[PDB]
Amino acid sequence: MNIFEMLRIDEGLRLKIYKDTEGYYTIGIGHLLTKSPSLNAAKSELDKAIGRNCNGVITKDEAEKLFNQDVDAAVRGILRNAKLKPVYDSLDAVRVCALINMVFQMGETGVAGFTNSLRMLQQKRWDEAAVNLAKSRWYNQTPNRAKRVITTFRTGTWDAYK
Structure with a gap:
């Protein structure tokens, strides 16, 4: 197991634009396109990301390219953030994946707000x-995903994903 295989489980793979758990337009492996309610706005973001007229549809290779970019971005977000970097420093090779998983889902700023849980970590x-x-x-x-991520933090094992 690793962060890619973990997030692949938690996000799945979709080749057409859909709405996530927050009702936001998303594609691929959990790639958030926009918080705008406009599908046209989502499609504009998609076409810019890929560099072609996608008409709301991408390939698996295109999804993996975005996915790699998105995990990288989540890591950079943790490393630059005054609240998140100290947590990262305390997390072993398995537990760090739970933190990356949270940042992937919610973003740097969203995760940085979990002040008390972060201090505990x-x-x-x-x-x-x-x-x-x-x-x-x-x-x-x-709750399904959060339970899995929480177990990873708690145990430092991949037991929730196996």
Whole structure:
């Protein structure tokens, strides 16, 4: 297992524009296009991302290209963020994937708001962090995924994905 295989499970693969759990236009492997309610706006973002008229549809290779860009971006977001970098520093090779997974889903700014759970993670209070993350609105909204991500934080194993 690794962050790519983990997120592939949590996001799935869709070659046409759809709406995510927040009702936002999305494509590929969890690639958020826009928060605008306009499908035309989403399509404009897609065409810019790929560099062709996609008509709301992409290939698997195009999805993987975006996916690689998006995991990279999530990592850069963690590394640049004063709240997230210290947490990253305390996370081993498995637990760090749960943090990347959160940033992938919610973004740098969204995840940086989990002040108390983040402090718990930074201090290696795995069980405290897991309890506190459970709870969250995040968990209430997407409990299936959140449970899996929380177990990864708690245990430092891939048990929730296997």
